[PDB]
Nucleic acid binder design. Structure first.
Ligand SMILES: [Mg+2]
Ligand SMILES: [Zn+2]
Ligand SMILES: [Zn+2]
Lengths: 102, 99, 50, 79, 1332
DNA sequence: TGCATCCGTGAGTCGAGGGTAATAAGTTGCGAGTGAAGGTTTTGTTTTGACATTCAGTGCTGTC
């Protein structure tokens, strides 16, 4: 600033916190899923969600899924494919259609 | 010029200057006296906390506008406690007497 | 073309701003004579007269 | 209304309380969403609140008598 | 979260380690290739915080595998980030060094010890030693020892004395001393010898010592041993976009500590010789002060910029820091700028706005409405639907916009009305449309001056933009009772053409039936805008109680005057529109409109005065040219008739008669005496030169010039601006500013000379170099005027206390000046006041004084009445509405909650920008009053006075005065006081050079007490013979009689002194110099004849408020009584006063002229020297103190054409008087001045019936108002704006605290302001303290 | 009661294009640390004895 008005301190941005619009789309991402999880079953919710760690502090895996219900780790991945397939029918992925467009 | 919500600085978490860097305006200290004489208190809380600094305010303002509940939850400016750490830098103890 | 304010004159007091109109209003008047005398095509002898 | 809130001050008695007693009124209808008393006439919530005011319909006491019956009638329901 | 108050004290070095997180030991910040925070570094993760999310550096504890585990290999945790602003670091020094706020400035540490800074500066610079503690009593403490005399103190004794030369040597002097032995021994001898300049240091230390006692501060902490390090979001190290780095300044400054501290603790390990270790501890305080104050102690310190550095305190110092620019004012979102433009079709509450500006600004408000519509599904979907040009985008835009009002702003804000709140209307443009009528509220016009825009997002401020700041809530300005929608240029012109009375128009004389049908006749070409036509109308009055009463009458009126009746809402007479309608009549025609009908018709009315004002100008047309300006032929001869005379006194100047001044003052006159007559040249040639013939021979009427209809309109100027066109344009001058001998003979119609255009720059470039720095001097003056008024908000309805000031006019000087009723208007009466027929008391001790009750006071001839001001109101922390009367802006009874001061601080500092650019005869007949007079019947019959307090005032017979003038001590008159004086009769006469020493007694003269060669000369009159003993002036005469006071004794034939009638005081004139007594010895002089004659702005506003005494104060009379004179010029004359029963002799600069003689009586309230006149606060009351100041600076505005209600200045006089020096003691301290309110507190708890008398009496005090903000109980109100280094030292040595009570305190911290809408909050906060 | 010797303020918004440079030693070991690389290890994922079960591949039986 050639008159005693401005400095280099004015001209730099701190892209650290979040974008205002994008911190809003985090919640609309989150409040999408639980309604999308609401069209499911309780044993069906508990295999797919806590594996990915949604709303839990941890990331459970196929072993901690296996040793708890009974033994099986094989069919839970196949249980989630039925949690994939009925939701990949374009009837409950409308509120997944725009977050698909990230 | 226009700016709804744009970019911010790094030392004081304030909007920026100009039509160039997608900047906000300047609400100068002459205008605060022009605003005090109306007695319009709430806009003076509005035009420093929720529109310049208060980071919990500036999101929960901007999130709540998308709902319609045109409601304020204010706080303290971050340029207030940028002043504390520098007045605390020079061996002076400043603090807050809690209620 | 331009409809502008009259009252910019008397406290700025530019009488000469008015005189930009007065002299040049017949600078058109010369250019309205000859332009009317080229779709008529009299001779050189009137343009050499004018 | 759109032009004037002077008659809204010859009702209450205060220019600044009007900024408060309408805001307390409209916050029950902005997000509380209750029924208005005047017809709408295609207006935002701040305009029906001031049209409520001119006929003497929303006061500081009427904003509290409307809740104090509504408090205990809600507090006669929890048990 | 929420906190009640704050606190500040000196921070202990135990407090610093408890503040911090880890000790910064190495200057490394980032590595040269790996851009990484450094272990044990400045940006260290082990001290200050984490950066990325749950991610350590080397990669051991990640991904929530180990929650609370530090990576012990690298030292770094896993926890939640963004503490890089909250988390401070610290450092432990090796040798302690000194604070520079606590040393350089009194010093405040050497001031504690009464030790000179020069005594410190041999120690803390390592020049010579000083004692710590003499073990033996042979020496004493606080003794500088030079290093060679130190060795003599070594080699004498060795062990019986202790003395260092170090900062520890001062550190030991704070641990050693006690205070309870000192502060009760300063108590012991404060009563011994209380001579002030020794006792004022016994005043300051019993503060300073007992400051530390009851607070808990210790002066050990006053020299640093530990330092705190700023969290690195205050000292960053940022790259640019191009791989280039740019840091804060404090990374450099912090670096100079940690290296230079390191090469001490290493140099200690090697035992460097005792010369070098001194310079080692030298450089620390050289580089510690480099943090605090860069250019303070010695030479400045600059780096590679070759410019000085920004320090730590320079981030809080000046307006470069944070108090003046980043806390009060700020940056802001939701805003923008554009250019203004007019609108002749907007109504007043509306305004224009672009589409592209609002759709870009209201983007958060659209994304809420689209989900309520559902066309957009999610947020990122709705952002996509802006660019795609949906018709619902502009169907939600208007639906967001409607009833959401919007601020507009312009710089410079000069008063309250610079910001307003209109309603939007959309337009297909890119420039902010604006109402034309608000250009009086901004002093602005349309040359591209940009304007800001702002949105009140919350519900509450949107109501403020509708209830408070909506542009139809406030029409009446707080300067006076005339509105601010004075119509500006063409609406004042469109009327003035239309309402007119010529005979030119066809149709004059036939009768019409109604103001509708004039449309059918004037537009058809049977009527004219001005044709004088009889019309039958139907007006309406309110002779009932708020109810319309009809009447219908006929008026021989004009046609264009009748069409204005189509709008006016049936309350005004037809006589109010029966004139030419200039700017004078129109503004009252709004004022009388809302005087009668209330406010809301006058906002509908001014709408429909703007729509007609352009429309009948669009019929009319106003055209100018060169033909409209006419020079009369009386230009050639009028200058030629003086042109023969400019060689005449030049030829006298060749004959050598006339001097320089008598010829210069005559060439300036006759060159301009005809220039006075060039106004008389163009009056009768250009006012009624028109000849239009109409049923007679000719007609003399108004002009057809189309210029004099523009100035009687009020658009630009008056009859002094044509003189620079039609005649010659006055005189000219130099930028030095001396008036020219040869003025101009040309103008703008004929053509000036190349030299007349040369010297024309001189009056014009100066005339713009003047005002371009006269806008700086008011933006100064406003900024401190708003600081004394930062506490002022109403509290209560009534204090109910004693009465106050008295309302009279200011009619001195000439005619009527101010009507009393207008100064009466707006107020509440103080005293029980009546009508001139006795005891018709129109008040119940208080009445609101509106305009109809003002008509009563204009009806009666009575002209004196008392009215409560802010001085007689005595509610603490505010004023009362029963002492304010009318809020001039809102125009009714002032409520509770409003501000007071800042409206006046905006009022008074606004037109400072618009400001800077013999015998006394009777006028008319009436009564005669001249009292407080002691006089005599002279040798000529009439009233000759011999007193100071007398002057002439001219009255009518009723009692309300017309004129008044000062008459001198000793003025000869021609009629008597209490008589009848006709109009035009010469009353007074006096020589201006002499002040007479006229003899009031009658006796013989005798040449006594002067013998030639001692106190006098002999100067006989060689022409006449008549000369008495001629007194000489103060320096020429002999000193042998300079101790003898020279007196011509008035004697009689026996040998006495002829006494004054009434007294036994001897009558002899102790005559000072230059006063030649005329008559010789033995002559009887009369009563009343001269023995001897004694022949001979805006920074002006910045005296009247800045509480400054002049350079030539006119002294008053301290105590009355029979006074003598005193000493003979040992610097100055002294004055021996002996009262009637009472008890002083003091300096007199006797080289000016004194008033009272050696043995004359004086009364208190009389000047003893001449000149201009704090003293009037000291000896007189309180109301007359406010009287001279209010009647001086309001007087300035009348001189340069502004009107301001005098209450606004009276608001400041109350804030000019806050303090009270105290006389006695018993409850508190003795003589230090304190808050007058608190001095009214302790009378009400201890002088009241708890104790008969234990208190202390007190006068009123007066600070300068630039320091009354610095001398305050709050401190951040004083640290926000000026001298931030000083006010944060003294605030911390005492252990102050704040209550956040001022309104500058609630605004910086993000609280709600304690006024207006927020005052109704803050008392619930106030009532929750006393209850819980 | 001066005599000077330093202290410290001078309105307010936008636009403006981008920017630094002086100087200086090598040679020598040896330590701590960025890579590639040993592929084995804890965890994703493949088929077979069989049984309660759903179900489809055999003929049957029954009706209209
Ligand atoms: Mg302009
Ligand atoms: Zn690590
Ligand atoms: Zn009062």
């Amino acid at each position: 600033g050639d008159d005693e008005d401005s400095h280099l301190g004015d001209f730099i941005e701190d892209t650290t916190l979040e974008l205002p619009l994008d911190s809003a789309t985090t919640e609309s991402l989150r409040a999408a899923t639980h309604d999308v999880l609401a069209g499911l079953t309780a044993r069906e919710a508990k295999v797919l969600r806590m594996r990915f760690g949604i709303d839990m502090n941890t990331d459970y895996t196929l072993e901690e899924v296996g040793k708890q219900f009974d033994v099986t780790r094989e069919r839970i991945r196949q249980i989630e494919a039925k949690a994939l397939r009925k939701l990949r029918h374009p009837s409950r992925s409308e509120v997944l259609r725009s977050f698909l467009d990230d | 010029h226009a700016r709804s919500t744009g970019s911010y600085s790094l030392v004081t978490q304030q909007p920026l200057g100009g039509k160039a860097q997608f900047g906000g305006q300047r609400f100068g200290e002459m205008e605060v006296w022009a605003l005090e004489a109306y007695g319009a208190a709430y806009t003076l809380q509005e035009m420093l906390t929720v529109k310049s600094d208060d980071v919990n305010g500036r999101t929960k303002m901007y999130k709540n506008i998308v709902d319609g509940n045109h409601q304020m939850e204010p706080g303290m400016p971050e340029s207030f406690n940028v002043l504390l750490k520098e007045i605390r830098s020079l061996g002076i103890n400043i603090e807050l007497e809690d209620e | 073309d331009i409809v502008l304010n009259p009252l910019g004159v008397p406290s700025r007091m530019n009488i000469g701003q008015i005189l930009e109109t007065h002299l040049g209003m017949a600078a058109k008047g010369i250019g309205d004579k000859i332009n009317a005398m080229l779709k008529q095509q009299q001779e050189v002898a009137k343009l050499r007269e004018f | 209304a759109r032009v004037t809130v002077q008659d809204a001050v010859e009702k209450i008695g205060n220019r600044f309380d009007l900024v408060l007693v309408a805001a307390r009124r409209a916050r029950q209808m902005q997000v509380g969403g209750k029924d208005p008393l005047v017809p709408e006439e295609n207006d935002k919530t701040t305009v029906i609140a001031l049209r409520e005011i001119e006929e003497g319909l929303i006061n500081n006491q009427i904003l509290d008598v409307r809740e104090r019956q509504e408090q205990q009638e809600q507090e006669a329901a929890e048990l | 979260e929420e906190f009640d108050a704050i606190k500040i004290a000196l921070a202990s070095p135990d407090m610093i380690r408890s503040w911090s997180f880890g000790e910064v030991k190495k200057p490394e910040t980032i590595n040269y290739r790996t851009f990484k925070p450094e272990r044990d570094g400045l940006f260290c993760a082990r001290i200050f915080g984490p950066v990325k999310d749950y991610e350590c550096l080397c990669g051991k504890y990640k991904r929530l595998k180990h929650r609370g585990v530090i990576c012990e290999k690298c030292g770094v945790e896993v926890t939640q980030t963004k503490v890089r602003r909250e988390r401070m670091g610290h450092i432990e020094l090796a040798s302690p060094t000194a604070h520079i706020w606590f040393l350089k400035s009194p010093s405040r540490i050497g001031l504690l010890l009464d030790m000179p800074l020069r005594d410190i500066e041999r120690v803390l610079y390592f020049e010579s030693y000083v004692v710590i503690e003499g073990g033996m009593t042979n020496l004493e403490r606080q003794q500088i020892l030079t290093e060679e005399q130190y060795l003599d103190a070594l080699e004498e004794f060795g062990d019986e004395f202790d003395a260092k030369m170090g900062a520890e040597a001062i550190q030991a002097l704070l641990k050693s001393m006690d205070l309870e032995q000192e502060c009760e021994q300063l108590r012991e001898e404060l009563n011994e010898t209380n001579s002030e300049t020794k006792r004022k240091k016994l005043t300051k230390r019993i503060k300073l010592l007992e400051a530390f006692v009851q607070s808990g501060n210790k002066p050990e902490w006053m020299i640093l041993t530990v330092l705190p390090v700023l969290p690195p979001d205050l000292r960053p190290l940022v790259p640019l976009d191009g791989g280039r780095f740019a840091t804060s300044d404090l990374n450099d400054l912090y670096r100079r500590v940690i290296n230079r501290n390191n090469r001490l603790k290493r140099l200690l390990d090697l035992a460097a010789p005792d010369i070098i270790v001194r310079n080692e501890k030298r450089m620390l305080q050289e580089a510690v002060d480099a943090l605090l104050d860069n250019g303070r102690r010695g030479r400045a310190i600059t780096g590679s910029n070759k410019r000085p550095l920004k320090s730590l305190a320079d981030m809080i110092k000046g307006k470069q820091g944070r108090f003046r620019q980043n806390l009060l004012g700020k940056r802001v979102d939701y805003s923008g700028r554009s250019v203004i433009t007019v609108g002749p079709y907007l109504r007043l509450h509306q305004c224009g706005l672009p589409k592209k500006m609002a759709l870009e600004l209201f983007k958060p408000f659209i994304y809420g409405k689209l989900e309520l519509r559902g066309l957009a599904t999610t947020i990122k979907a709705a952002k996509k639907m802006v660019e795609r040009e949906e018709a619902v985008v502009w169907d939600i835009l208007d639906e967001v916009i409607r009833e959401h009002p919007v601020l507009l702003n312009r710089a410079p804000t000069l008063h309250r009305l610079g910001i307003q709140a209109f309603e939007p209307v959309l337009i297909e443009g890119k420039a902010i449309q604006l109402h034309p009528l608000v250009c009086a509220a901004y002093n602005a016009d349309f040359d591209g001056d940009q304007m800001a825009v702002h949105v009140p997002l919350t519900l509450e401020a949107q109501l403020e933009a509708r209830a408070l700041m909506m542009s139809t809530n406030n029409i009446l300005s707080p300067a006076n009772g005339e509105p601010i929608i004075v119509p500006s240029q063409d609406v004042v012109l469109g009327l003035y053409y239309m309402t007119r009375d010529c005979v030119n128009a066809k149709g004059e004389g036939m009768v019409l039936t109604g103001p509708k049908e004039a449309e059918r006749l004037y537009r058809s070409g049977l009527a004219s805008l001005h044709a004088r036509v009889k019309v039958r109308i139907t007006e309406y009055e309110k002779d009932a109680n708020g109810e319309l009463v009809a009447k219908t009458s006929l008026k021989d009126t004009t046609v264009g005057r009748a069409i204005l009746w189509m709008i006016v809402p049936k309350g005004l007479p037809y006589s109010i529109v029966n004139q030419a309608l200039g700017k004078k009549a129109i503004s009252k025609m709004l004022n009388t409109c809302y005087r009668i009908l209330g406010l809301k018709p006058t906002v509908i009315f001014a709408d429909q005065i703007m729509y007609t004002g352009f429309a009948y100008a669009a019929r009319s047309g106003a055209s100018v040219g060169i033909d409209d300006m006419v020079i009369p032929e009386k230009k050639h001869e009028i200058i030629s008739e003086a042109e023969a005379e400019v060689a005449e006194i030049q030829e006298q100047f060749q004959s050598g008669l006339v001097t320089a001044g008598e010829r210069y003052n005559k060439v300036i006159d006759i060159w301009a005496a005809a220039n006075d007559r060039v106004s008389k040249a163009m009056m009768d040639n250009l006012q009624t030169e028109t000849v239009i013939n109409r049923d007679g021979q000719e007609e003399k009427q108004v002009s057809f010039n189309s210029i004099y209809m523009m100035a009687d309109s009020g658009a630009r100027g008056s009859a002094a601006q044509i003189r620079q066109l039609a005649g010659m344009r006055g005189l000219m001058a130099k930028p030095d500013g001396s008036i020219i001998e040869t003025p101009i003979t040309a103008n703008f119609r004929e053509g000036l000379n190349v030299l007349q255009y040369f010297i024309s720059t001189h009056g014009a470039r100066k005339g713009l170099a003047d005002t371009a720095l006269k806008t700086a001097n008011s933006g100064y003056l406003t900024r401190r005027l708003v600081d004394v008024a930062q506490d002022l908000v109403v509290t209560e309805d009534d204090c109910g206390t004693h009465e106050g000031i008295m309302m009279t006019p200011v009619i001195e000087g000439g005619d009527v000046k101010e009507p009393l009723r207008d100064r009466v208007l707006g107020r509440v009466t103080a005293e029980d006041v009546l009508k001139p027929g006795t005891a018709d008391i129109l008040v119940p001790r208080n009445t609101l004084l509106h305009e109809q009750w003002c008509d009563l006071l204009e009806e009666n001839s009575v002209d004196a009445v008392k009215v409560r001001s802010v001085v007689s109101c005595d509610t603490d922390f505010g004023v009362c509405a029963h002492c304010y009367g009318r809020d001039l802006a809102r125009g009714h009874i002032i409520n509770k909650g409003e501000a007071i001061g800042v409206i006046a601080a905006q009022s008074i500092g606004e037109p400072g920008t618009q400001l800077t650019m013999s015998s006394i005869q009777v006028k008319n007949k009436g009564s005669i009053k001249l009292s407080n007079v002691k006089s005599v019947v002279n040798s000529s019959g009439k009233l000759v006075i011999t007193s100071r307090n007398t002057e002439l005032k001219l009255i009518d017979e009723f009692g309300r005065t017309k004129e008044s003038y000062k008459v001198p001590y000793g003025a000869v008159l021609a009629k008597g006081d209490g008589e009848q004086v006709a109009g035009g009769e010469t009353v007074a006469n006096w020589d201006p050079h002499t002040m007479p020493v006229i003899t009031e007694v009658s006796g013989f003269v005798r040449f006594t007490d002067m013998i030639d060669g001692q106190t006098i000369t002999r100067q006989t009159d060689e022409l006449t013979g008549l000369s008495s003993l001629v007194v000489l002036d103060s320096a020429e005469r002999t000193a042998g009689g300079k101790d003898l006071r020279p007196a011509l004794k008035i004697v009689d034939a026996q040998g006495n002194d002829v006494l004054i009638p009434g007294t036994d005081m001897p009558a002899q004139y102790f005559l000072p110099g230059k006063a030649i007594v005329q008559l010789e010895d033995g002559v009887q002089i009369s009563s009343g004849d001269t023995l001897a004659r004694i022949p001979q702005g805006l920074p002006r506003v910045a005296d009247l408020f800045e509480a400054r005494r002049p350079k030539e104060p006119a002294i008053l009379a301290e105590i009355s009584g029979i006074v003598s004179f005193g000493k003979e010029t040992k610097g100055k004359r002294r004055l021996v006063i002996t009262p009637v029963d009472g008890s002083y002799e003091e300096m007199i600069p006797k080289w000016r002229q004194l008033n009272v003689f050696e043995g004359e009586r004086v009364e208190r309230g009389d000047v003893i020297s001449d000149g201009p006149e704090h003293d009037i606060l000291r000896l007189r009351g309180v109301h007359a103190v406010t009287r001279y100041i209010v009647n001086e600076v309001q007087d300035v505005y009348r001189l340069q054409g502004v009107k301001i209600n005098d209450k606004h200045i009276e608001v400041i006089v109350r804030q000019m008087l806050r303090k009270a020096t105290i006389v006695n003691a018993g409850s508190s301290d003795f003589l230090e001045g304190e808050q007058v309110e608190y001095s009214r507190v302790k009378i009400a708890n201890r002088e009241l019936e708890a104790n008969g008398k234990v208190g202390a009496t007190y006068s009123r005090d007066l600070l300068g108002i630039t320091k009354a903000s610095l001398a305050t109980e709050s401190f951040i109100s004083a640290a926000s704006f000026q001298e931030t280094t000083r006010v944060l030292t003294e605030a911390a040595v005492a252990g102050k605290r704040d209550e956040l009570r001022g309104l500058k305190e609630n605004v910086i911290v993000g609280r709600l302001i304690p006024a207006g809408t927020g005052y109704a909050y803050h008392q619930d906060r106030m009532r929750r303290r006393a209850a819980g």
